[PDB]
Design a protein around this motif. Sequence first.
Motif, PDB file in Angstrom:
ATOM      1  N   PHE A   3       0.841  -1.188   0.000  1.00  0.00           N
ATOM      2  CA  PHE A   3       0.000   0.000   0.000  1.00  0.00           C
ATOM      3  C   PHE A   3       0.879   1.242   0.000  1.00  0.00           C
ATOM      4  CE2 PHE A   3      -3.722   2.366   2.211  1.00  0.00           C
ATOM      5  CZ  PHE A   3      -4.042   2.949   1.006  1.00  0.00           C
ATOM      6  N   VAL A   4       0.709   2.083  -1.014  1.00  0.00           N
ATOM      7  CA  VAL A   4       1.436   3.336  -1.107  1.00  0.00           C
ATOM      8  C   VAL A   4       0.383   4.399  -0.841  1.00  0.00           C
ATOM      9  CG1 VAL A   4       3.220   2.575  -2.699  1.00  0.00           C
ATOM     10  CG2 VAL A   4       1.027   3.376  -3.586  1.00  0.00           C
ATOM     11  N   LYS A   5       0.159   4.687   0.436  1.00  0.00           N
ATOM     12  CA  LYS A   5      -0.857   5.649   0.839  1.00  0.00           C
ATOM     13  C   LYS A   5      -0.377   7.089   0.945  1.00  0.00           C
ATOM     14  CE  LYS A   5      -2.008   6.099   4.856  1.00  0.00           C
ATOM     15  NZ  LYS A   5      -3.442   5.752   4.657  1.00  0.00           N
ATOM     16  N   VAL A   6      -1.325   8.010   0.824  1.00  0.00           N
ATOM     17  CA  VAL A   6      -1.045   9.431   0.938  1.00  0.00           C
ATOM     18  C   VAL A   6      -1.622   9.900   2.267  1.00  0.00           C
ATOM     19  CG1 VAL A   6      -1.421  11.718  -0.012  1.00  0.00           C
ATOM     20  CG2 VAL A   6      -1.053   9.786  -1.542  1.00  0.00           C
ATOM     21  N   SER A   7      -0.831  10.668   3.007  1.00  0.00           N
ATOM     22  CA  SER A   7      -1.217  11.173   4.321  1.00  0.00           C
ATOM     23  C   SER A   7      -2.632  11.742   4.435  1.00  0.00           C
ATOM     24  CB  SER A   7      -0.191  12.200   4.801  1.00  0.00           C
ATOM     25  OG  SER A   7       1.108  11.846   4.360  1.00  0.00           O
ATOM     26  N   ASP A  11      -0.218  -6.173   3.764  1.00  0.00           N
ATOM     27  CA  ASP A  11       0.981  -6.837   4.258  1.00  0.00           C
ATOM     28  C   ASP A  11       2.084  -5.861   4.640  1.00  0.00           C
ATOM     29  OD1 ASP A  11       0.149  -9.734   3.567  1.00  0.00           O
ATOM     30  OD2 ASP A  11      -0.058  -8.696   1.644  1.00  0.00           O
ATOM     31  N   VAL A  12       2.318  -4.837   3.821  1.00  0.00           N
ATOM     32  CA  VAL A  12       3.276  -3.785   4.126  1.00  0.00           C
ATOM     33  C   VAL A  12       2.616  -2.445   3.830  1.00  0.00           C
ATOM     34  CG1 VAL A  12       5.351  -5.160   3.769  1.00  0.00           C
ATOM     35  CG2 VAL A  12       4.292  -3.991   1.842  1.00  0.00           C
ATOM     36  N   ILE A  13       3.133  -1.399   4.466  1.00  0.00           N
ATOM     37  CA  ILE A  13       2.605  -0.051   4.307  1.00  0.00           C
ATOM     38  C   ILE A  13       3.742   0.863   3.870  1.00  0.00           C
ATOM     39  CG2 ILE A  13       2.980   0.755   6.663  1.00  0.00           C
ATOM     40  CD1 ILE A  13      -0.055   1.478   4.441  1.00  0.00           C
ATOM     41  N   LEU A  14       3.425   1.813   2.992  1.00  0.00           N
ATOM     42  CA  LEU A  14       4.378   2.821   2.528  1.00  0.00           C
ATOM     43  C   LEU A  14       3.705   4.181   2.691  1.00  0.00           C
ATOM     44  CD1 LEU A  14       5.902   1.097  -0.636  1.00  0.00           C
ATOM     45  CD2 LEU A  14       6.813   1.178   1.688  1.00  0.00           C
ATOM     46  N   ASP A  15       3.833   4.763   3.882  1.00  0.00           N
ATOM     47  CA  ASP A  15       3.224   6.047   4.192  1.00  0.00           C
ATOM     48  C   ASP A  15       4.226   7.191   4.226  1.00  0.00           C
ATOM     49  OD1 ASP A  15       4.449   4.898   6.332  1.00  0.00           O
ATOM     50  OD2 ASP A  15       2.771   5.107   7.731  1.00  0.00           O
ATOM     51  N   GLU A  16       5.514   6.911   4.045  1.00  0.00           N
ATOM     52  CA  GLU A  16       6.511   7.971   4.029  1.00  0.00           C
ATOM     53  C   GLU A  16       6.346   8.836   2.786  1.00  0.00           C
ATOM     54  OE1 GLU A  16       7.667   4.749   3.464  1.00  0.00           O
ATOM     55  OE2 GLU A  16       8.211   3.984   5.448  1.00  0.00           O
ATOM     56  N   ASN A  17       6.475  10.151   2.970  1.00  0.00           N
ATOM     57  CA  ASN A  17       6.335  11.086   1.861  1.00  0.00           C
ATOM     58  C   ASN A  17       7.571  11.150   0.978  1.00  0.00           C
ATOM     59  OD1 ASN A  17       7.989  12.309   3.715  1.00  0.00           O
ATOM     60  ND2 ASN A  17       6.656  14.073   4.090  1.00  0.00           N
ATOM     61  N   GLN A  18       8.685  10.566   1.406  1.00  0.00           N
ATOM     62  CA  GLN A  18       9.911  10.545   0.624  1.00  0.00           C
ATOM     63  C   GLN A  18       9.977   9.253  -0.177  1.00  0.00           C
ATOM     64  OE1 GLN A  18      12.655  13.104   0.558  1.00  0.00           O
ATOM     65  NE2 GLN A  18      10.703  14.090   1.066  1.00  0.00           N
ATOM     66  N   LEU A  19      10.312   9.372  -1.463  1.00  0.00           N
ATOM     67  CA  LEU A  19      10.431   8.188  -2.306  1.00  0.00           C
ATOM     68  C   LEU A  19      11.530   7.261  -1.806  1.00  0.00           C
ATOM     69  CD1 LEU A  19      10.107   6.443  -4.902  1.00  0.00           C
ATOM     70  CD2 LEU A  19      11.624   8.077  -6.012  1.00  0.00           C
ATOM     71  N   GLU A  20      12.673   7.826  -1.409  1.00  0.00           N
ATOM     72  CA  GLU A  20      13.780   6.993  -0.951  1.00  0.00           C
ATOM     73  C   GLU A  20      13.373   6.147   0.248  1.00  0.00           C
ATOM     74  OE1 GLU A  20      14.695  10.523  -1.178  1.00  0.00           O
ATOM     75  OE2 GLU A  20      15.548  10.403  -3.196  1.00  0.00           O
TER      76      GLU A  20
END
Lengths: 199, 48
Positions: free
Chosen positions: A129-133, A172-181
């Motif tokens: 999941f690539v979520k936006v804040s 399964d995993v979360i991607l909530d960081e606003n930085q691509l790196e």
Amino acid sequence: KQAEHVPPYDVVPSMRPVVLVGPSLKGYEVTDMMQKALFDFLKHRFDGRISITRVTADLSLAKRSVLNNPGKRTIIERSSARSSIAEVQSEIERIFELAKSLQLVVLDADTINHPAQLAKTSLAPIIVFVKVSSPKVLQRLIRSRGKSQMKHLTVQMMAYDKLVQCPPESFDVILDENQLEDACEHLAEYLEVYWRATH
Amino acid sequence: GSFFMLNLVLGVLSGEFAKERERVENRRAFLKLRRQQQIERELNGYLE
């Protein structure tokens, strides 16, 4: 008790497929780029040990207990013989045999917008999941594209909020960081743990 | 007449400013100013 008869054991793919979902509908600029960047990072970091292919065909109908063989022949000229379900099943065995290869697999199918659409199947892919804040940031981002995405901004917001209402344990995993790196090394560390665990 | 008076004025004014800064009408505007800055900080990385 044979009305359903859920089997205790299911033959899932050897390697769980990696799929990205969010933050909006697949097939629109924001989602395509947001996923494209991660796909490129995964290809470059895991070069020589990962295979990534786009799944044009539909995938949400990965069933196991519909019938003995729905549409065994294409010349029957039946409701399912002339359909594209057989393509879906063929892609299912294609994914199964590619996971048999023991190398990591990442799916680029544009028919996934919620893990609940692919949670009762046999694949059970690794939902990423690539979520936006917040909604304001997403709609600002959409405004940054142009009028073409302003036309579909409504459905993009609707799908975004529906997918956010999905609870964290579904993914399964979360991607909530606003930085691509930071998200890149997060996913890289998770897949490195998976690789070291299965060897 | 000069140093003590100025100190008293300075202290009373600073206390008044401190008391006024935590009223609801000013705190509600500061929260808005902080929220917009936070939104912009995230949007920068997302355009990156």
